[PDB]
Amino acid sequence: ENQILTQLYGRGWAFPPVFSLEKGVEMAEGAEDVRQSLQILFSTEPGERLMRENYGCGLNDFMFENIRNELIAEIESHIHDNVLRYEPRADMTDIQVRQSPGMGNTLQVQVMYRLRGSDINQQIQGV
């Protein structure tokens, strides 16, 4: 949880925007900005940002369509070229799309990513 990765990715506001009485707004630092920069993109849908009209993952335009191998291969293609446009700091390395064992309707996507320029593991969980 060091100061070095802040110099590669910068400090920004945390996506749960919780404000504190000391230190002001909680700042998402370097390795944790790039994870939260992916959490903002998957959580907004395109068109509801104000002037940046096409920003956000459109997974809404293909749901309520049946789970087959052709829908799964359309998610991995869509989720790959969208992180390329709106996330320059995180390179994707694998996408795993599969339907859950418990409930058959829901399917769970898992994005594995590395940060660009750096191969430094996170020590433990936090911020």
């Binding site: 910068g10 400090r11 920004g12 996506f15 700042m27 903002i40 940002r49 002037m51 940046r52």
Partner: protein, 131 residues
């Protein structure tokens, strides 16, 4: 026509470039990520569109800004009828010359009664007021 000259200036793309320059000078060390993802810029992009909304209402034409809502109006238009050029430029009859201008005006149809409102010249063809 104030809108066509200020149109490049009251704009989202040019107000946002104003707003990034305040951040890049004053908080470049503590706030170093100004990309399109973070909640800090999306609050600013909400505000800098609201200012572009707010500054657009100033560039409406002045006859449409100065008119009130149709529920509340003083009877005639933008400036009241006492403030027209007929009352703002004209002065009172003080000279013997504009005594003559006023007395020459008087007319039979200006009378409140009589002569079926159609007959009559002006009441005096000439007057002369003197000490």
């Amino acid at each position: 026509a104030l809108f066509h000259s200020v149109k490049d200036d009251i704009h989202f793309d040019t107000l946002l470039e104003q707003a990034h320059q305040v951040i890049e000078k004053q908080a470049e060390k503590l706030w170093s990520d100004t990309a399109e993802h973070d909640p800090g810029i999306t609050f600013l992009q909400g505000i800098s569109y609201g200012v572009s909304d707010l500054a657009y209402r100033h560039t409406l034409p002045l006859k449409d800004l100065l008119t009130p809502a149709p529920d509340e109006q003083q009877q005639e238009g933008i400036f009241p009828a006492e403030f027209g050029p007929h009352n703002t430029l004209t002065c009172g009859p003080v000279t013997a010359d504009d005594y003559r201008k006023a007395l020459l005006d008087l007319h039979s149809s200006d009378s409140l009664d009589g002569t079926q409102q159609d007959e009559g010249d002006f009441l005096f063809r000439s007057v002369q007021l003197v000490r």
